[PDB]
A paper describes a structure:
Centromeric chromatin in fission yeast is distinguished by the presence of nucleosomes containing the histone H3 variant Cnp1CENP-A. Cell cycle–specific deposition of Cnp1 requires the [name]–[name]–[name] complex, which is thought to direct recruitment of Scm3-chaperoned Cnp1/histone H4 dimers to DNA. [name] is a homologue of the human WD40-repeat protein RbAp46/48, a well-known histone chaperone found in a variety of chromatin-associated complexes, whereas [name] seems to form a bridge between [name] and [name] with its N terminus binding [name] and C terminus binding [name]. Current structural and biochemical data suggest a model in which [name] provides the principal link to the centromere, whereas [name] is responsible for recruitment of the Scm3–Cnp1–H4 complex, which allows Cnp1–H4 dimers to be inserted into chromatin as a prelude to complete nucleosome assembly. As expected, [name] adopts a β-propeller fold, consisting of 7 WD-40 repeats, with an extended N-terminal α-helix that forms part of the histone interaction pocket.
We identified a N-terminal truncation of [name] (residues 51–112, Mis19C) that was capable of interaction with [name]. The crystal structure of [name]–Mis19C was solved at 2.0 Å by molecular replacement using [name] as a search model. Residues 56–63 form a β-strand that continues β-propeller 7 of [name] and stabilises an extended loop from 107 to 116, which is disordered in the [name] structure alone. This helix leads into a short loop, and finally into the C-terminal helix (α2, residues 99–111), which sits in the H4-binding site of a symmetry-related [name] molecule. Analysis of the structure shows three main contacts between [name] and [name]. The first (site A) is formed by the [name] β-strand and proximal loop. The third (site C) comprises the C-terminal helix that binds to the same binding pocket of [name] as H4α1.
Numbering used by the authors:
A (entry chain B): 56 to 69, 74 to 112
B (entry chain A): 15 to 162, 174 to 418
Write the structure that this text describes.
């Protein structure tokens, strides 16, 4: 006694190991880039765009 | 407080309506089913059978009950008519074997109901012998059943939820409970008859955690490595060959809040995940164990459930009291996003399942299908779902 909310048949046709040292550096490097871009800004980017327009 | 409860029940109703509106654009398959009793546990059994003359296959789920009153508890096996919805998983050439449709009707029957003593806190089939199921039951006893009780395991002095078979040593079992203890067991099913219930005592007891032991798992490729996580905020790695009185060879302060689950990658022998009350999943390299690889952020409340995909090394699922099951793709870690895309969260958050209207109890990846998950919540609803191949392919 089951409700089928959606069924979409998958037609015919459409796996490398993770290097953990590479994952660790990508995690840390992305965190550096996201603190520089987003955290405690020193000016509002929208201010600059308005003045340059 | 009354207002909080009103607002929460309102928010959930709106969320569920909004989800249903978007289900056609999110999934290739969604099946819902109201169980007679809510279950605390779910696990797909390994077998799938294409049924000749139909548009479905039969696959099976291990469920339990938790009545907590004066009603009888049961270990249950449910049989699901899984519709043939995927060209890749079914041999359609014999055209007695038909393709399923959105208009089709598919059933779920309780195919086996075995009386169980107390809440079924967790149930797992022995990998080497799938007819054998271990449970965590009343007061901390663990129970063994032959589905084609056979034993009771006495050692815990409080109920528990950690339970795992050793995939490289048949009949070897580890358990962890709210008595702060981990017990190791040798379950020889040879002894089993059908008449009597054998009483087994532990082969070893670990007094290494200082709070509730929430989860244990053996390494898939090392018969002596046991991982455990606890409300004491530690992840611990035990060598079962060593003196139990000794400390665990490694104790990792993995989170600063309770750790509810541990999951060891089935393809990458050093990759391990922990799920915590701090709303986060942490990833670890066992070779470099005191420094976290990465933090998976996105859940809005405590994380309790955690299971790697059995088919794809970088794919991980987690569940939370935020009523979501999330699926993460480790290969996307560190990518950049447009501001609009970032509103949905980190790039490695691949998919979110928001169909449940209560706390999620447990989920289980379907081993015989592509990206199919069975998940449970407090309100007796079972969901069997599969995200759109457009998203993950
Ligand atoms: Br590596
Ligand atoms: Br401005
Ligand atoms: Br297991």
């Amino acid at each position: 006694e089951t409700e089928l909310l959606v069924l979409r048949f998958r037609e015919f046709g459409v796996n490398h190991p993770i290097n953990l040292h590479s994952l660790r550096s990508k995690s840390l490097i992305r965190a550096q880039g996201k603190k520089l871009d987003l955290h405690n800004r020193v000016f509002l980017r929208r201010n600059v765009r308005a003045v340059k327009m | 407080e009354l207002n909080a409860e009103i607002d929460l029940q309102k928010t959930i109703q709106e969320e569920y309506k909004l989800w249903k509106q978007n289900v056609p654009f999110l999934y290739d398959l969604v099946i819902t089913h109201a169980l007679e009793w809510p279950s605390l546990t779910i696990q797909w059994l390994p077998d799938k059978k294409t049924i000749p003359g139909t548009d479905y296959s039969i696959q099976r789920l291990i469920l339990g009950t938790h009545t907590s009153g004066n009603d009888q508890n049961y270990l249950q096996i449910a049989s699901v008519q899984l519709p043939n919805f995927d060209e890749d998983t079914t041999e359609f050439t014999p055209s007695t074997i038909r393709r399923a449709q959105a208009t089709g009707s598919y059933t779920i029957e309780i195919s086996q109901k075995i009386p169980h003593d107390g809440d079924v806190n967790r149930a797992r089939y022995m990998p080497q012998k799938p007819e054998i199921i271990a449970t965590m039951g009343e007061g901390g006893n663990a129970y063994i059943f032959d589905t084609t009780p056979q034993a009771v395991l006495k050692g815990h002095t409080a109920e528990g939820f950690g339970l795992c078979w050793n995939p490289n040593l048949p009949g070897n079992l580890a358990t962890g409970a709210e008595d702060q203890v981990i017990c190791l067991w040798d379950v020889q099913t040879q002894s089993f008859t059908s008449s009597e219930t054998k009483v087994i005592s532990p082969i070893a007891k670990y007094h290494r955690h200082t709070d509730i032991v929430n989860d244990v798992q053996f390494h898939p490729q090392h018969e002596a490595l046991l991982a455990s996580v606890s409300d004491d905020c530690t992840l611990q790695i035990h060598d079962t060959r060593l003196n139990p009185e000794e400390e665990a060879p490694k104790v990792i302060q993995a989170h600063s809040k309770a750790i509810n689950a541990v999951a060891i990658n089935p393809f990458n022998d050093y990759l391990l995940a922990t799920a915590s009350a701090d709303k986060t999943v942490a990833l670890w390299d066992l070779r470099n164990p005191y420094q976290r690889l990465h933090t998976l952020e996105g859940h809005e409340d405590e994380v309790y459930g955690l299971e790697w995909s059995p088919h794809d090394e970088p794919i991980l699922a987690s569940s939370s009291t935020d009523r979501r099951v999330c699926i993460w793709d480790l290969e996307k870690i560190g990518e950049e996003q447009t501001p609009e895309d970032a509103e949905d969260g980190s790039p490695e958050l691949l998919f979110m399942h928001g169909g449940h209207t209560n706390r999620i109890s447990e989920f289980s990846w379907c081993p015989n299908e592509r990206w199919v998950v069975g998940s449970l919540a407090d309100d007796n609803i079972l969901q069997i779902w599969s995200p759109s191949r457009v998203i993950w392919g």
